[PDB]
Amino acid sequence: MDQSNRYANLNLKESELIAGGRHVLCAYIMKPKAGFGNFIQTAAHFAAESSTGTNVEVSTTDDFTRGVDALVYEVDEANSLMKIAYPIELFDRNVIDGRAMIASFLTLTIGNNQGMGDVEYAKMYDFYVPPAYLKLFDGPSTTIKDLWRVLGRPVINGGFIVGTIIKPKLGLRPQPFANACYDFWLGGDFIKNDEPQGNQVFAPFKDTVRAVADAMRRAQDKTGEAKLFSFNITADDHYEMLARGEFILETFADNADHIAFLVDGYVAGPAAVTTARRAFPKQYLHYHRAGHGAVTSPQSKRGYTAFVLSKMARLQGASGIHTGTMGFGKMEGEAADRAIAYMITEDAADGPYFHQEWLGMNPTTPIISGGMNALRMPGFFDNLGHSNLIMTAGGGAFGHVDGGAAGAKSLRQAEQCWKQGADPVEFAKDHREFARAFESFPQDADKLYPNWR
Amino acid sequence: MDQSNRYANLNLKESELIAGGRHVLCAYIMKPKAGFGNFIQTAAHFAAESSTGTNVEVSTTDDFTRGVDALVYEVDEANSLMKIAYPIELFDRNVIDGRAMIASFLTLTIGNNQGMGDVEYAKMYDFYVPPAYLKLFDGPSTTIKDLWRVLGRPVINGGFIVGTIIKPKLGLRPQPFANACYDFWLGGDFIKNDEPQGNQVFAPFKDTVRAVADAMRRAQDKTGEAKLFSFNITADDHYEMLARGEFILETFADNADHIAFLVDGYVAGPAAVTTARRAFPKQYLHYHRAGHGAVTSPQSKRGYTAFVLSKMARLQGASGIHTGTMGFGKMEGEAADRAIAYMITEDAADGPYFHQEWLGMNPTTPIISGGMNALRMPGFFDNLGHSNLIMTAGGGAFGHVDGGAAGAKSLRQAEQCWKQGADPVEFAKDHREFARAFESFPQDADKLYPNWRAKLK
Amino acid sequence: TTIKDLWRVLGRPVINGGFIVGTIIKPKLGLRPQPFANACYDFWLGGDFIKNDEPQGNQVFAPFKDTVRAVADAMRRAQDKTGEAKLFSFNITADDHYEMLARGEFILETFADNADHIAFLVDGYVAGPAAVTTARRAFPKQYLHYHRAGHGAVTSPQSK
Numbered sequence A: 001m002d003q004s005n006r007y008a009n010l011n012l013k014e015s016e017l018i019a020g021g022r023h024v025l026c027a028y029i030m031k032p033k034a035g036f037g038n039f040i041q042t043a044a045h046f047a048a049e050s051s052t053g054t055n056v057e058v059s060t061t062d063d064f065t066r067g068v069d070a071l072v073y074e075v076d077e078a079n080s081l082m083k084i085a086y087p088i089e090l091f092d093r094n095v096i097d098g099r100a101m102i103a104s105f106l107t108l109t110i111g112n113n114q115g116m117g118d119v120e121y122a123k124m125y126d127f128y129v130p131p132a133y134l135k136l137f138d139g140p141s142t143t144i145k146d147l148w149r150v151l152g153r154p155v156i157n158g159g160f161i162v163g164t165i166i167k168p169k170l171g172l173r174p175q176p177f178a179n180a181c182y183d184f185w186l187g188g189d190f191i192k193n194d195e196p197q198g199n200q201v202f203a204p205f206k207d208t209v210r211a212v213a214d215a216m217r218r219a220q221d222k223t224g225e226a227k228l229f230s231f232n233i234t235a236d237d238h239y240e241m242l243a244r245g246e247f248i249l250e251t252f253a254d255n256a257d258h259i260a261f262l263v264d265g266y267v268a269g270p271a272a273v274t275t276a277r278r279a280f281p282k283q284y285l286h287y288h289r290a291g292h293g294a295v296t297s298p299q300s301k302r303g304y305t306a307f308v309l310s311k312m313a314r315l316q317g318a319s320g321i322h323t324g325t326m327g328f329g330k331m332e333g334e335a336a337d338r339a340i341a342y343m344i345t346e347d348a349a350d351g352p353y354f355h356q357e358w359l360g361m362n363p364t365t366p367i368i369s370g371g372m373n374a375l376r377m378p379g380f381f382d383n384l385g386h387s388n389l390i391m392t393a394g395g396g397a398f399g400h401v402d403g404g405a406a407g408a409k410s411l412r413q414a415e416q417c418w419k420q421g422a423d424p425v426e427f428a429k430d431h432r433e434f435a436r437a438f439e440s441f442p443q444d445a446d447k448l449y450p451n452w453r
Numbered sequence B: 001m002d003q004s005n006r007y008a009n010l011n012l013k014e015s016e017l018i019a020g021g022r023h024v025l026c027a028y029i030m031k032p033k034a035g036f037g038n039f040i041q042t043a044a045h046f047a048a049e050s051s052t053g054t055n056v057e058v059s060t061t062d063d064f065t066r067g068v069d070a071l072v073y074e075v076d077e078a079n080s081l082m083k084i085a086y087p088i089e090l091f092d093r094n095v096i097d098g099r100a101m102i103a104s105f106l107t108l109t110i111g112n113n114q115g116m117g118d119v120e121y122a123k124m125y126d127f128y129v130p131p132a133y134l135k136l137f138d139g140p141s142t143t144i145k146d147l148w149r150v151l152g153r154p155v156i157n158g159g160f161i162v163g164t165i166i167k168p169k170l171g172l173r174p175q176p177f178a179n180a181c182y183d184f185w186l187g188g189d190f191i192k193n194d195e196p197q198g199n200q201v202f203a204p205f206k207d208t209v210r211a212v213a214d215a216m217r218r219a220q221d222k223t224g225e226a227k228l229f230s231f232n233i234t235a236d237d238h239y240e241m242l243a244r245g246e247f248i249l250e251t252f253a254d255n256a257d258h259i260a261f262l263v264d265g266y267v268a269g270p271a272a273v274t275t276a277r278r279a280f281p282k283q284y285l286h287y288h289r290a291g292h293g294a295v296t297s298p299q300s301k302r303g304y305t306a307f308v309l310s311k312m313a314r315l316q317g318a319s320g321i322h323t324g325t326m327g328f329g330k331m332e333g334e335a336a337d338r339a340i341a342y343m344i345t346e347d348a349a350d351g352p353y354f355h356q357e358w359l360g361m362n363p364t365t366p367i368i369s370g371g372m373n374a375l376r377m378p379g380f381f382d383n384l385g386h387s388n389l390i391m392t393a394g395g396g397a398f399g400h401v402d403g404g405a406a407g408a409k410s411l412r413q414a415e416q417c418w419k420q421g422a423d424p425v426e427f428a429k430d431h432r433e434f435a436r437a438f439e440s441f442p443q444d445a446d447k448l449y450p451n452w453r454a455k456l457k
Numbered sequence C: 001t002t003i004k005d006l007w008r009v010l011g012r013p014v015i016n017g018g019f020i021v022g023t024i025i026k027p028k029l030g031l032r033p034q035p036f037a038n039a040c041y042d043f044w045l046g047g048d049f050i051k052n053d054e055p056q057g058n059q060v061f062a063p064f065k066d067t068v069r070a071v072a073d074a075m076r077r078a079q080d081k082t083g084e085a086k087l088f089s090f091n092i093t094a095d096d097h098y099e100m101l102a103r104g105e106f107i108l109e110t111f112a113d114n115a116d117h118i119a120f121l122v123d124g125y126v127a128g129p130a131a132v133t134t135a136r137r138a139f140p141k142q143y144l145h146y147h148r149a150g151h152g153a154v155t156s157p158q159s160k
């Protein structure tokens, strides 16, 4: 049967649904499966499976039920575009405090509709959230401002945070791990656990934390500068996340405001992210997205995009989220991905389909990571347009020919070169650690700065 | 750089890595992106990004680190097959109790590797978990056996639990919702919240729970039989899940062993599933997988299959998990998906690539749902082979021409027919509610039982 | 939890896995942490399972936390030497519910990757059902060992 008379109204105007402030709007690229309905019928069925219906009429439906139906308001068969309007009354709210949950938004807008037999694929590209719904989300409580304050930087346009990931990914016992943190910190600001580091049997959590705290104190005393760490506290069990966070804050003591908490939020879920957001609102929430590629990749025609994810992460409370290297590194990415960063940092931004007012909600930091080194940084900043961010480089730092300290210094210098408007090879005559990144990575050097020899 | 001399050892034997007990094994269908390295180099890099390395040599690597490298032990370029062995030392364990977390397994075996630029796609199809690692997982604490006990059925081969989903998906205010529960229960056993039902402003949670409890009491009084309900307690906030679960158990009181807790585990994540598994181990954990299709669909070449998801759900502690209609309903599915059910219910089972011994870990119930009705049920059981399960049918029940109660009876009758093995259409001659399911869904009827109109009048 | 969980940890078949060879540590009381730990090591070279004698806990000459720590060290020296899994049953009995919790939590965390080798013992007749239920509901995944010291006052055939 077909349900477009009830779940489609193409005579509605997007400008009026927005000005009315009663509807979440979602934009999808969808294709029906050969053998069922035409585009409108398939789209109307989609809206029903995502709102108030199923595949047949049921005797229990009443007039109040119809009032909250999600409607298909705009379609473009030749570009595969479908747009749906969801009344805000559909979304779940906490009993304890009346706030919104991201899990409800996902369950409706991108849940069972992803397994419909009469649809070949559908992927969400953009969404709009009006004021009355927007205000019920947590938003971030800690920002890069709080990291700038701890480093001694100005709290407005404090600049580039030079960082690394401890490599190898797994395998370092507590003291070697701690020794490699010391070395980087002699030249850099910030260090994160690689996403799987935690409580492996060859590197127990408590011994590793304790050896890193010792290394932070020794690095601060030697250099006279503040240092930062991002610990992974990801777990299935909510009380294991708490236990880990509490041990860290207590162990670091007077360096407790130098600590960020990392959460693998795509594989652990919103629940893990909200555990850390609500239990530790004063510690920088670092959101790591490992596994996201299964859906976000342009090779995928299902799910949602990295843009959508990032937009959601901000509403959830992430202090920073990995946004990718925008084609500049080792992972899949595009230069057009610069728009992702601007949606998460500004108070008004444009998406592929929707303009979004954030109403003063705190910004989320773009965390640039993924096969970056000193040589690839200039090109990257040129495309994005600023350096008010954290950038982590593991192989780029520990793979430097002269070690982790020098690797750290080459990343600083590379941003000073860009900031100044200087030519890389020429700049590399006054700055040795940067010059040696050319011999560290001669394959990259030959590509970007050909005749450097 | 070529890393195949470190992360590849094709001279290892699957049979010995299994016997040896020290490795998790994963099987993937992988294709390298053009103009990079070959199959083995791509595969070796994959293993490095999924264990100890990165795309570049680092001066901090030591011989201890190598001992724990994940290795590529089997490749078949023609079939796109890649197999990797992960030392169990690599996986994270809780400080509080020394147990395993599924989140660690995922982060390594299907994480950063899903965004690698030199790989076009990779999807996990099967995994093996040895004893030393399998025994560190929660497993389910509550099974169908506990729902059979409550209904009064035998606790071994207790049979088919007749169920529904409350429809409209959303829109019913507390009393009309409660009235629709009452009606179904006059003919059926079990009712679930549709996956988004919770605390919407037009249907507050506490008023809905209270009206449902009253309707359970009045249904049990009128019919003399035990009734069940599965409440959605999904939330971002751990303490909101607890608050919801505690209010339900306390409200239902002497009917609180009739209550299951439903969790949208795919979109909310493992952490939400574990919250419910650890806080309420004596209430049946109902795992709902809304959103899974983004990766599990055969149209996807990335992520992992429904098979893998289901296998994971059991290790996490799901009492039951939606396994799909296996091609007989409205969602994407296949007949070959019967193997999924057999992996989650038995103590030893075969996957597409590995054999798994569960070592006595509790089974997970297959929950069959998705555009089912009385007419589609016979075909479905014939393919699966048994009816020791829960099946929910929303439109199938409430869209029956004579109502929710008659809709419920038609689902019962359809399993009774398959059980004794009658001709469906002849069975319908002497079974009213089942016969009227033909007129309720005449499109389906004409397709499955072609000449039915003649016999049935 | 059942014996089948203890068979799984030892490597035995989970159905008819057989006879678990065990001891109590004697002296009933009097062993200081290391000597107590040394006696655990020695038995484990030939046996599977060890329990606290029913009054062992936090006596002033053998503090609880030093004893647990020394037993953990002896478990992994025993597993290293023999190549086989070992088990221990710790008494966590107390009047105060939160003292039971505090003791159980310290043990699981100390033993770490050997935490599934731990059973919790409760003197359920003298402390009562409430103590048994505390341990049943707080730690459902750890083997609940019920000790009945004092039961004879009523169960005896001398008693009518």
Ligand SMILES: O=C(O)[C@@](O)(COP(=O)(O)O)[C@H](O)[C@H](O)COP(=O)(O)O
Residues within 6 Å of the ligand: A165, A167, A194, A195, A288, A289, A290, A322, A323, A324, A325, A330, A331, A368, A369, A370, A371, A372, A392, A393, A394, A395, A396, B054, B055, B112, B115
């Ligand atoms: O795990 C890694 O390999 C990284 O630490 C980079 O290390 P290297 O510097 O040695 O490459 C990051 O987690 C990935 O970039 C994550 O990807 P994304 O940012 O796209 O989520």
Ligand SMILES: O=C(O)[C@@](O)(COP(=O)(O)O)[C@H](O)[C@H](O)COP(=O)(O)O
Residues within 6 Å of the ligand: A054, A055, A112, A115, B165, B167, B194, B195, B289, B290, B322, B323, B324, B325, B330, B331, B367, B368, B369, B370, B371, B372, B392, B393, B394, B395, B396
């Ligand atoms: O919302 C729905 O559509 C359902 O309640 C079915 O309703 P109907 O029975 O009325 O069609 C189920 O959530 C899906 O079937 C889940 O699918 P899966 O088992 O594939 O996860």
Ligand SMILES: [Mg+2]
Residues within 6 Å of the ligand: A165, A193, A194, A195, A196, B112
């Ligand atoms: Mg990483």
Ligand SMILES: [Mg+2]
Residues within 6 Å of the ligand: B165, B193, B194, B195
């Ligand atoms: Mg549903």
Ligand SMILES: [Mg+2]
Residues within 6 Å of the ligand: C024, C052, C053, C054
């Ligand atoms: Mg004794």
